[model samples]
Target: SVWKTLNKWLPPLSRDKDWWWKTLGPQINTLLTEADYDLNERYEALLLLYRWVVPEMGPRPRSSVAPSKSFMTDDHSPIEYSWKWISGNKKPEIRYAVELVSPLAGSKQDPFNQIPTRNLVYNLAKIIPELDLTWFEHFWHELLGPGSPLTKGSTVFAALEMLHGHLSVKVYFIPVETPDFSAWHQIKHAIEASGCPNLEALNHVDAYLSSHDDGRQLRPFMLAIDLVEPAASRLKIYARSNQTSFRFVRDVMTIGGLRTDLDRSIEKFSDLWKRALGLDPDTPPEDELPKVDHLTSGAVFNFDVAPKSQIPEVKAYIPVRHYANNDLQAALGLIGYLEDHGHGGYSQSYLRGLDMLAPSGQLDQATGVQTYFAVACQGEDLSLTSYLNPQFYAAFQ
Candidate 1:
């Protein structure tokens, strides 16, 4: 088992009896120590990672049905991590950020989707103690509760970000299959309840909703809330292009309130599309490797909202698995894009981190390991960020 060969990554691997230290502990410890994080920050984040992210990261029973079967949540680890790096940085500033699925309902076997979303977060918050659930309670009432305009398979994601000494808990959702303006109104009411307004272009959302009635579009909206303070929870609204086309993504940006020149942003997407997909925009591919529309549901317009801004700054998400052979290819492509804009200095360290996370051979063959590469931009400025799923079962099992 790759996990059994665990000593590979301090500098990235563990488990104690009550906690699963062997899975993600080495990476967390190395990152915090190398990044010079103080005690309290390391303590809290580690607590959450052990207690929440991988309580199940231990040896499978001897009688387990298959020898390779692991204890991870499904075939993947419960937590996904990301680093948002800008072109201006002299080096990679990998912040303390993570997206996770919770299991402190005290039973990993309990079906999470069966539990009401609010109660899910409510239960998750109880163990963290740093989190405040009121914002979620108010918002989820309409967003995920009875009569939700959000589709049946509409999902919620919870994340934690450590900035300086402030700990922020963010909850994100995929709102799809809403069939009308009234449904979107219900959606807005939930966001508004959390004091997030200025979400423009309801007609666009309604149009998508109306279009979805004919099954023309599904998976149109992505909404999220950053639960940071009692008075300052933020809103991050993203729109996804289900059709996987550049023009469709532009519509998403407009709906998310980006008013900048569309060409520059599209150009950046093109740069990543070409590199990550290994397809030159000037010369289209002949063979059907992965169809355009079939490539992981296209891109996401991540809207970074400000307190008093006229519109949100837009970030584009590149689906790495769409055409790239694997995560390393996409990561390398991202490093190249960053180099084009003078942020390539961090590439070596980023590559080191990836190697520590897992070897290229194992990572390439796995799906969902490297999910999306997101570039935040407003005309000329570009910041790169990417997500990873540390599903230990696949490699370690």
Candidate 2:
């Protein structure tokens, strides 16, 4: 409907790239040219500027969705939607990013989770001032906003922050590697620092916590929980390997009826935890996924939750399968967040710097350090996820 109304005034073009581009080129042009600038500033700005443009303005080519949805990649996969905390007071302001979803086998529906199509981008520009104007589509997607308001490579942390706000604590899990003690420790501090009540801790991860004093002995997931200094004083962590916490991650990762890479990752993570907790890891009983109501604010959702006597601290872990679901887009969101908003900014900077040294001049390490965490933080991935407020979806990119 919006496209129909707005198509009347699009800018004219000369060359047509393909049947799709050629057919739509002049139609789009007519709209761009005819639309009134003032009343339709937002629409005009978005349609003319941010809508995909050709290398040279010739016969109007059909706008490219690749430029719009998958600004980072041209692969045949869908985009990912993610976020994480940047810097904030009690409740950290989240940094969010998006990647398109693929319609292929290895891919799931992460892109459908949210799409910043030309229309959506135009609408968003009206809200986020940094985004509020007609600019180059590539500029908006890659560079982002006035003077690059978006952290080019920082989409994941923002997604996490959005997840925190949307899911609350009823369902929370983290990615981790083996010898997971450090992961839990970091989660504990983050939880208390986060100050939410409905949060739960994850324990299915398999990584170890590097000893502050010695780095020799690696601690397993269960053992790492014991190693954390204030373990007794910190937030809560789930004791079971295949608890409901993990089930939630599994279902969402699967787009259709088939299981996704995430499913396998969570399963493996849970198996490691099963071994660490001294339980049988093989064919363990799985928990049921919670039914979440999707909210208009993409990542945000509403759930019917029962009030509980909120605890101060907790420990938790996710299934290994959940981690595996990450495609290029998914991985990029997290890496981008770390790059754009990490306190020191050194971690992200280091990743991009590594890219320059690569054989190729292009620096496209979409999945880097965050990938390590995606696998490593399994055993003691603790957080107050349930306690997170419901407004998080509103923060997603």
Candidate 3:
């Protein structure tokens, strides 16, 4: 059933040029019109264009097939040899990495194995403008195979170099699970050692401890990395613990929310109010609790404005990597469009699937949009229709 849905979006070949001309083409042109197509419509149109141009060569090579087996056994060696330049030498490169679990597990019936891979690949292809679909598949196979260094502590480290070696726009990783801080440090060391692109450094202590349930308890951890610049922006890891899995606010954003709360100086004023009326922090005056609740019930609210507050200010802080950076905002605009299109549930499904991959019960809409867009734009140029299809020969040749 899910396969049918996937094929609906990304078939082996689009034999219906008429569907493109009659439905998809006009939809794409709407991006150029003032007819008020919302963001999701534009995104859906872009996705249509993306699906139309992206070449899906039948079923993905089986993870249990000869190529997969060969790739898996080569785990002892590095992937540097195959990292040579390709046809799109001039374009920016984007890379992807995934954590290693059971490489030999051929449970095709498990949604755990199927959903994330599909959504990850689909979202990646859609957001990154011209990423080579076939090359992405190649890398996907390699990265997931036993040969990849991802399972070791250097998941991000080796992944960063691998992408850099390929040469292009940006790089993204699927949900990666880290059992403890030791595994995470490997990635930090890799970033420092390689001098690869990253977002702002998040203090590790605050990144993990403060975000989880208690500052002490440790549980299963998961993360997704987004490095848009060759090496500039904040090196943020979208983090979630089993305890706070539903609260998808990233480390930096959580800190930002805290900073916003402190900046408002609410604690000081509240204290002043208490002292002015001579109330204790714990006990307070007799009528204080009830009166306070009544006064603040509908009148006062605590809001985390970090997403809106930080996006504009922090956007410029990251180093620019051509179209890669701006496309994140474009993707966000599309999701927002979806909400307005009365497809909030539909939009949430994309995010829910991602969260499911890592078991992060919470959803960070901003990060979700950016992650999808980043992956979409990661690889070789997919914009040139002629490069993809020879039928456009009359238009160019």
Candidate 4:
């Protein structure tokens, strides 16, 4: 197994290696310090490499477990404190958090429960080229705290104080969500209508039949239309409740007939075109007549674009995120914003589950909105968050 492979390569290390040898012995050193691999990510990468080299060990832990529970059981009761450093005092990565928090997932003293002797050595070998010995200063603090064999806490603090340039840091927040459908369509239209040569080419597709039918058979035409069968199905999925999850068409792509929308493609596209033109003022928006509040929470996001007479000059992506049903704090705030601002047009935007068809959709089985927390980042700034904590409304904006 991998454990044997790892064992053959190196022995365990009880102490951090001496870096002074490099200065005294080697004429050169090669390492990567420019890459901003954060402490948590680097640690996770080390763990991944460890798992790969030592198959006997399981994967690394996640880093989101509450800090107070870092060294305890689920009820905050004490267990062996082996994993405490994983999530103890930092928002490292979830992998580290879970490793630090849980009392090891299986048997208490399973070989995999403790950090692998082989893993520690090999990971050090791989990470040495990527980070410096100083990185271990942080690791040692996490691993052994004040009385760590590596250094005195006071000494570490004094070193930190001597470091150059002590400017402070802070955080702020912003929010985004799935654009509403009408708005999404506006964006799609803008992109298509941009008249950019690429986008112009995206406007239409042609279908033809080559069968010798005295021009009587639509077989060749129908077959040619089948060329876009997959795309048509994708559009149908996009239309179904406008979920932020991966397209439903992706979920069961292997089924027969899943590729073709021959049954409804023409009708649906024609209806869409007609409604988009605003040709018939009285024609309520397709699927716009019904109250969408009943659809799966998945469909309720506020897409970031809106339809307009003019196309946008800039090209951008439609951002999306998943895991909403259990993330109520995030959803309710965004959904409420869309609703109050008149963007929540239909329940189809939030359709959940495998089948998005009306009768079989998750909405048909649903009763009401459910609640959960949302982890959010604002405006690409790493330090700030707009929490939509349970029962809290004003936190996210």
TM-scores of the candidates in the order shown: 0.71, 0.23, 0.31, 0.20
What lDDT does model 4 reach? 0.22
Candidate with better lDDT, 2 vs 3: 3
Q: Report the error of model 1 at residue 247, Å.
A: 3.9
Instruction: For each candidate in turn, give its C-alpha RMSD to the true structure in angstroms.
Output: 6.5, 20.0, 17.9, 24.6
Q: Indicate which candidate wins on TM-score.
A: 1
Worst 10 residues of 4 by lDDT: 218-227
Candidate with top lDDT is 1
Residue-wise C-alpha lDDT for candidate 4, range 293-319, written one tens digit per residue: 422223221111112211111111111
lDDT per residue as tens, model 3, 87-187: 23222222222222223234544212323334444555566544444433333333333332223222221122223222222233322334443434443
Q: Write the per-residue lDDT of candidate 2 for residues 343-367, one digit (tens) a residue.
A: 3233333233233222232223222
Q: Relative to the true structure, how large is the alpha-carbon lDDT of every model?
A: 0.53, 0.26, 0.27, 0.22
Report, for all candidates in order, the number of backbone clashes.
7, 105, 28, 27
Residue-level lDDT tens digits of model 1 in 1-397 = 2222333432232423223465466666555444445667777666655555554333432232322211112333445666656456543334433323333322444222324334435655775577766766676666655545433222465666655465566776544444563333555566556564454433334454455432234333556676545346555556554555555554554543436566676677666767876565573322233564642455555554534454545566777655567777777778788788777765776666666666446656644556677766566555667665554544554
The lDDT-based order of candidates, best leading, equals: 1, 3, 2, 4
Candidate closer to the true structure by lDDT (higher is better), 1 or 3: 1
